[PDB]
Amino acid sequence: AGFIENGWEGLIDGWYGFRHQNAQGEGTAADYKSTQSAIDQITGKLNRLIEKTNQQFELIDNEFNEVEKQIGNVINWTRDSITEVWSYNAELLVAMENQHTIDLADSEMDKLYERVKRQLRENAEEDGTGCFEIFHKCDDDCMASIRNNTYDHSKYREEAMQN
Amino acid sequence: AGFIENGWEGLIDGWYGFRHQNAQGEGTAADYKSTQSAIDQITGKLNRLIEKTNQQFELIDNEFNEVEKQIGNVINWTRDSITEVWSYNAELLVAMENQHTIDLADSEMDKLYERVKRQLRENAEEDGTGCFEIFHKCDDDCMASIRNNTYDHSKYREEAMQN
Amino acid sequence: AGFIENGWEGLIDGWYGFRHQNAQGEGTAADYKSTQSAIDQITGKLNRLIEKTNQQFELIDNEFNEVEKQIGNVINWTRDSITEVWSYNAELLVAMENQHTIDLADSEMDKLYERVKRQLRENAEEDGTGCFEIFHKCDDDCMASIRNNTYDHSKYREEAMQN
Amino acid sequence: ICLGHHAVSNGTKVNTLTERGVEVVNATETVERTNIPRICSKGKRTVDLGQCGLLGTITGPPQCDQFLEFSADLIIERREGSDVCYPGKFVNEEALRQILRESGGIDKEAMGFTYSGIRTNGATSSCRRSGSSFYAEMKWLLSNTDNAAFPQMTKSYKNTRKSPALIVWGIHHSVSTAEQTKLYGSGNKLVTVGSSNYQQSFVPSPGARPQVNGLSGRIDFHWLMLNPNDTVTFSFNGAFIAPDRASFLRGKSMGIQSGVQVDANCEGDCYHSGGTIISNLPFQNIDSRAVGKCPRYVKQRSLLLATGMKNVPE
Amino acid sequence: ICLGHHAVSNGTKVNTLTERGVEVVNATETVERTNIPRICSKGKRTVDLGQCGLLGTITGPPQCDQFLEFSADLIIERREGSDVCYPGKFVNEEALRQILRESGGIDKEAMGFTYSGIRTNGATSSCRRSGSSFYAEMKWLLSNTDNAAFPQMTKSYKNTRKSPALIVWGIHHSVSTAEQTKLYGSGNKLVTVGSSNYQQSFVPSPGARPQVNGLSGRIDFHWLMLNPNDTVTFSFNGAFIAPDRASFLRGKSMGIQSGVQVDANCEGDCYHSGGTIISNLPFQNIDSRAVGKCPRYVKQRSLLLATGMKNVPE
Amino acid sequence: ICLGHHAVSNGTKVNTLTERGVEVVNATETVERTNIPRICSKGKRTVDLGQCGLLGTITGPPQCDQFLEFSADLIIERREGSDVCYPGKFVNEEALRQILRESGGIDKEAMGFTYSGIRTNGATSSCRRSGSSFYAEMKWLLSNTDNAAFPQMTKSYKNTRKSPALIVWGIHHSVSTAEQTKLYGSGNKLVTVGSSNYQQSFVPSPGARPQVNGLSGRIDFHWLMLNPNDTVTFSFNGAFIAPDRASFLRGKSMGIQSGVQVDANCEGDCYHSGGTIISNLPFQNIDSRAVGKCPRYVKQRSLLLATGMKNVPE
Ligand SMILES: *[C@@H]1O[C@H](CO)[C@@H](O)[C@H](O)[C@H]1NC(C)=O
Ligand SMILES: *[C@@H]1O[C@H](CO)[C@@H](O)[C@H](O)[C@H]1NC(C)=O
Ligand SMILES: *[C@@H]1O[C@H](CO)[C@@H](O)[C@H](O)[C@H]1NC(C)=O
Ligand SMILES: *[C@@H]1O[C@H](CO)[C@@H](O)[C@H](O)[C@H]1NC(C)=O
Ligand SMILES: *[C@@H]1O[C@H](CO)[C@@H](O)[C@H](O)[C@H]1NC(C)=O
Ligand SMILES: *[C@@H]1O[C@H](CO)[C@@H](O)[C@H](O)[C@H]1NC(C)=O
Ligand SMILES: *[C@@H]1O[C@H](CO)[C@@H](O)[C@H](O)[C@H]1NC(C)=O
Ligand SMILES: *[C@@H]1O[C@H](CO)[C@@H](O)[C@H](O)[C@H]1NC(C)=O
Ligand SMILES: *[C@@H]1O[C@H](CO)[C@@H](O)[C@H](O)[C@H]1NC(C)=O
What we know:
The complex is a heterohexamer, with 3 copies of chain A (163 residues) and 3 copies of chain D (314 residues).
Chain A: E1 16-21, E2 26-30, H1 32-49, H2 69-119, E3 124-126, E4 132-134, H3 140-147, H4 157-162
Antiparallel strand pairs in A: 1-2, 3-4
Chain D: E1 2-5, E2 12-15, E3 20-24, E4 27-29, E5 31-32, E6 39-40, E7 46-48, H1 56-59, E8 74-77, E9 89-90, H2 93-101, E10 106-110, E11 118-119, E12 124-128, E13 132-133, E14 138-143, E15 153-158, E16 165-173, H3 177-183, E17 192-194, E18 218-226, E19 231-236, E20 240-243, E21 245-249, E22 254-257, E23 262-263, E24 270-272, E25 275-276, E26 283-284, E27 291-292, E28 296-297, E29 304-306
Parallel strand pairs in D: 5-26, 6-23, 7-8, 8-22, 9-18, 26-28
Antiparallel strand pairs in D: 2-3, 4-29, 10-21, 11-14, 12-13, 14-20, 15-19, 16-18, 16-20, 16-21, 17-19, 24-25, 24-27
One 2-acetamido-2-deoxy-beta-D-glucopyranose (NAG) binds at residues 66, 69, 72-73, 76 of chain A.
Subunit structure (chains D, E, F): Homotrimer of disulfide-linked HA1-HA2.
GO cellular component, one term (chains D, E, F): virion membrane
Binding site for Ca(2+) (chains D, E, F): 69, 107-108
């Protein structure tokens, strides 16, 4: 989410995906395995945070007939302290989880980019804005071979090396 | 901060920067946007940690006339417990924040290095110690074009490819 | 631990290492400095977590003669609250430390891979599954030069560039 | 071929370690604020005390006649409840309330007290049933005739059951010393309760009090807990409300104070005075004094957790 | 063209999840240790009690004559303060202190008590004003003549205001039973206070005590809090210090105990006995018993937060 | 040339922020569960009270004759311990227990009380030594002859030492008022203790109690703490167990309750009723009421910390 200067608001099929533009036509297909990876990780975070406690706390005050003022001040003091502790823990928890979530998504995007980069050894060159320049017109069947990680890295080498 | 074998103690203008050495002269210029990015992130950490609490705690003990010994032992027990909790939270908070700060700066450095690497497609080659070998004498105007991200990646290609 | 499709169960000498296969024979040697780096970091985590507290807590209850029921309910209420706080802190601490540990090891592996990649400038090409294709038969002495970071990046250049 | 990520036109701002207001794709709430204004009691034995006070179930005023041997997993106290019919008060009342809230109900047993040489049918106009009555579990001991004296008496009770027994007696405080001489005779009266863990110590204090229910007399209610096979003993000479039946805790339950209706259609384990908190979120900003199995109370009303990536639109 | 990062010759070592002593470029402190040895009261109504004790403001010894109806947002207790002039003590004193610390001041109102057949001008040499006086808010009730008897009396007070009233009375304990017969007459004396939430119960105990201010007599001070429209009643026959004026809480304030001077030049919300903690840091290692709006106390004296990158010099 | 990482055939599953059951190479435990079923007292002055109760060391029943001036860094209470030989009880007993647990031992000093006109050798069959004895640190004051009267007495004690003194006296409660007239005479008895921080107030309550050790009489034990140079005073006229020697705290120690044996071979700072917790782990799931320098108690029985990388086998 850095050098990719933006997101595709039109990509409604998944989180990550491609958008190819060769001589045959246009293309925008979502990548299911990376999107499912990030979705699985966030889902795990939700499964860990959304939790039910089996610890039962009993009534220690009395809303209808106030208890002794001293023990009531001790009870209010302790309750306020615990409330401060849990407010701190909640704030820090949410902030940290959000940080690791954003960095997690960015990491998945970068690792995908490096995956496609390693698929295209010398037949393509990095553009600098998250795109790959292909020195030979890759048709739609070749694009589908790139998506499902079946593009041959040597049976298109010499043609692109000449260009 | 790994393969860059050190830091420039002479770089007093910013956090990150370049140091070019071509045939025209020397150069050391700080990069303002990355330095301002890391400075903005650390500043955000300080704005989040430096905080004022609106929770007022009242006096529960008595320094001049000691209270009942039993309720005093309960008060001291609770206060000591809360003190242990907050000492733990402070230690872990500082340690984690420092870890994420160091890793954050290292990440910014690496992403800058990858930025300049993507600016120089085939006209330069990685040296291995954080430098880029240029196969054609890039003058100071070309250096300034590299700094502000305006160096043309194709109008210097063939000359460096021959070398 | 992503595109390296697995681990070497036979690598019993260290955490990270190489496995070369040229024309002279086979090879599997562990890298001591990276393994010692990750081991040093995990060891530091253990030194920080395994800790002894100098805070002494005194007896506030009475197992043989139960105290007043009210102050006993306040004591049990406070103790249960503190127990919830420390159970939360322990769970979150362990989970976060494990996350940062796994990501730390993965980071060390990736940085090692990038190290060897930067050692082989144009004499080798990335395969895509964590291996490096060498376009000239590198003998065992050349392999040992690659391991201890002494392989010359230019005295084998033209031969591999022709191939 | 260009690859990237998705984005939306309107995201959700969250807070992180670094910034404040980072617009992400999707986010969910972690601090519960929705409250069900009812007492969700689906699947629990519930006893709504109503006009009966929790402590009254041990002494038995007219409003607690149908709560003398209740059994429940959830005990609800109401604001209109009253522990007494004759104006009185409990010593260590809140500790006894907390004991009865988690008792799971009470089981009464006749203590087997018989008397010789004294009256026993003391009554009042405030504890009204058919006519003028008294506490169902207590007996107002007086002198036989309209004045006379009170013989120094010693009655003992042994807990023959395997669970601790709840013993509750009462000291009387008339409107004056003359009325005390009318009920129990002249002289200094003294009440002594002793056991293995107890050792008192009771003397009356007659005097004029503000008229509650048209009565200026008061009754101090005291209680101890006998251990199994432990024996308690009373030595009294007047101004003594004798216990007729002892109480035994049934099992386990929970006690709450509320003012909303009971609903057997919803289920919940977190209760407060305004209703039930039904949520899976780890935190809540509804009531810091919520009891049961609750999310931990926090002061923040909202803490948005990021469930999507960073939203960077065009 | 080589790119890199900055470095310094002398960095700051910090602690992380991994190591201990990582030299970074810049770092800032998170645990406050600097303390202002004054009570920063800039912009707050402050009442320094000095030689007047906090509880005395309700009874009114000579040292509290200028604190009978104080009003403040910050109440400071001093070590030289005294609640009493005649040697005595308060029952439930610390609870009353905690009530008065957050009261925002007190407002006195004449209770409207008149007497017939008894004396009322009891005084002593310890409560000195012009000559021999007594507590300004109390009245030392005695028998009319130098001996005689005390008629059984019943005085009532109704709280006609919308806020709870603070009622404080006193039981007297003379040096002997003979002096008790001199002041109030022979026979067993009994004091009874009753209301809606209260029910006692008071009998004197004469005897010899260690001479405080040259006096061996003691005075027990007791207090209850009347609810609005609730009525309190006293039935006494001797050894009774009657209340003349009741107290009402003004609003809200904070109470601290200190021994340093008051300073209206600095502002602070965190106070302890040694001064004021003025800091923006989240933690402090000055006083674990600091009150107000304070950073949370920690045992570590320093926890350096990294504000710069890793420092790797040549 | 291919480079990679190591792996094992059988790893250890751990929990992270994301998943549950991530198989890593190596892992270590963080929650301690191993317990040493002994009281590790290596290098500490230990006093096992045994059949002697902790409070008894102040009064001195026959079972505490060898604990009147003990000195320890670790005090162990046993379930068979007893504070009394004559059936009695302590007022504010648990506060005194908590005071004595961290006292570091006690040091007795003769209070210097002499009497004129009364007997002093009161004894009983329960406090057995050579024959019929009494508490070693107390004196059972009676009237000179088998009936007669008790002269109103006033005895004073001044703490001449720089540390607070522990003063413990006893009120007697006979089986009846007739036995009270036999021991101390007829009439209302009254006991008054006064000092600088104290002010009571003591009257006896005779009556029949359940026979403990074949005796229906009881003894109330009370205690105050004199400050240095502060003077305490007693004014009594019967039913008074006088203190003969005062106590002074030696230094500092720790008090535990246990039922396991003492072992001088192992060392530990974390104790509970089942033994000693010797561990370097930050958490423990053994006893939430463990005292000393313990790992913090958690409800989880195990929390595996990852010490190795992710295990991805072939
Ligand atoms: C404690 O706080 C509650 C409100 O949460 C309040 O009603 C009560 O009065 C407080 N306790 C005392 C002793 O004031
Ligand atoms: C509680 O700790 C304070 C010091 O922080 C001490 O003065 C006080 O005596 C302790 N309480 C008891 C009951 O000893
Ligand atoms: C507090 O919990 C303990 C067990 O941990 C229990 O024995 C005790 O009875 C509880 N307190 C009260 C007042 O019930
Ligand atoms: C967005 O988050 C909410 C959280 O409640 C979830 O229910 C919803 O399915 C999420 N939407 C997407 C598209 O993931
Ligand atoms: C209680 O007493 C009965 C009869 O004296 C005896 O059979 C029983 O074992 C005793 N139980 C306990 C727990 O003391
Ligand atoms: C170093 O940190 C301190 C923290 O107080 C800050 O005031 C200062 O400006 C920082 N210096 C630089 C050069 O960032
Ligand atoms: C108090 O009593 C007065 C007069 O009896 C009445 O007007 C007022 O409404 C009452 N207020 C309350 C709160 O009871
Ligand atoms: C695995 O972890 C345990 C933790 O107790 C450690 O003792 C052991 O040395 C570790 N093994 C390796 C091979 O690191
Ligand atoms: C105690 O009194 C003695 C003699 O009266 C005196 O010398 C000493 O200084 C006093 N010490 C204190 C602390 O009051």
